[PDB]
Design a binder for this molecule. Structure first.
Ligand SMILES: CC(C)=CCSP(=O)(O)OP(=O)(O)O
Lengths: 223, 227
């Protein structure tokens, strides 16, 4: 009874650093090494997909110094994952990102595209509204060019047009104590089981992941 | 603790645990389902007193058709009690969901309940009845496609604000979602509308859900308020 697709809201990094008396940048430096560790663990448990929320469409509203740091820091994707054995995809609006980050992201996707193990989907400049809106625009355009009728518009069509693809998350884990999805995968989370923990992302370990999975299994047996 | 000055404007409710409550008392499932609207009305009365403006209650999902035909027929017949429960209550009632696939008598009862309570100035109860999140997004999308092909809007008018206006469940979106019964999912309830909603899950079965449990959800919500 292992979940095939886990979604992760990787919250608590800033709080982790501030509570420790560290610069906020120190919390953020743990983001990808921690995600990489979670991928290795999950891969060995048989988990096939992880979709991880790294930067929302709202996070542009953060302090420019933190946003610039993050945007620079995200360029380390390639070193972290290029030779890790994980298949990496990024979802979200890539064209807002600095061109060098766009290049770095394309490079990571390209070099890992033939990896056969765990598929890691990183949501970067992503929001559920915006996923649904781009899909809708795509459906309207196809209707406007005679490629589809109004009767063709169904769940399956949306599933094809959305950025985060089937199969949908079985389990969502959010670190950092808040019980919200914060405009992550709205359509895709319709039947996903939620697990919320006060544990901050940089403290989230193997034992924390196993507790979440155990909790999912019990809930799956019940429901 | 309960801050009168920070009530959520909008609570969404997933009213689960009615069937399991019946089996725990030895009773037939029908006995569980018959506490649904009386409990919902009680929740409305408590909420009105606290100053809550809107409740959206998940009564029947688009996937609940797949249940035992006995249970489905019983519910549809029972949903007719909506008029007796609410017509004289001071609550303003609206239904969302695909109304045309319900039995005809239920459709006229819904229309009558909406018409007789539309003048009420208090709490607005939105009953989600044959509703789903997929459904709401798809019907909005079909409506936007219709307008597009008739020259009434351009692809670049398609944005969050437009979508808010085409969906059946409207702004303001739920501040807080309470789900009774112990499952920790949203089960295709108000998907778009739950993007920032605080979730509260309890093992308490819906028929046992009371004023203390509700105030507990709200205090929790008040403790997590930010932005
Ligand atoms: C991007 C991640 C991991 C979480 C969202 S932080 P939040 O709950 O404050 O929501 P926002 O993205 O800041 O609007």
């Amino acid at each position: 009874l292992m979940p095939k697709h886990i979604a992760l809201i990787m919250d608590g990094n800033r709080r982790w650093a501030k509570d420790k008396g560290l610069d906020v940048s120190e919390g953020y430096k743990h983001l990808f090494p921690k995600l990489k560790e979670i991928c290795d663990i999950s891969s060995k448990l048989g988990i096939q997909v992880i979709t991880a929320f790294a930067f929302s469409t709202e996070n542009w509203k953060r302090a420019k110094g933190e946003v610039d740091f993050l945007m620079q820091m995200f360029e380390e994707l390639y070193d972290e994952f290029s030779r890790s054995g994980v298949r990496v995809s990024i979802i979200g609006c890539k064209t807002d990102l600095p061109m060098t980050l766009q290049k770095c992201i394309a490079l990571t996707e390209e070099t890992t595209k033939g990896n056969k193990g765990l598929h890691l989907v990183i949501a970067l400049n992503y929001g559920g509204y915006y996923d649904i809106l781009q899909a809708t625009k795509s459906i309207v355009n196809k209707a406007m060019n005679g490629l589809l009728d109004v009767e063709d518009i169904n769940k399956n069509l949306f599933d094809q047009e959305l950025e985060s693809k089937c199969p949908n998350p079985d389990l969502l884990i959010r670190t950092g104590g808040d019980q919200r999805v914060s405009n992550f995968l709205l359509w895709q989370l319709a039947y996903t089981e939620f697990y919320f923990t006060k544990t901050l992302f940089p403290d989230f370990g193997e034992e924390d992941l196993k507790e979440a999975i155990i909790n999912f299994q019990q809930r799956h047996r019940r429901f």
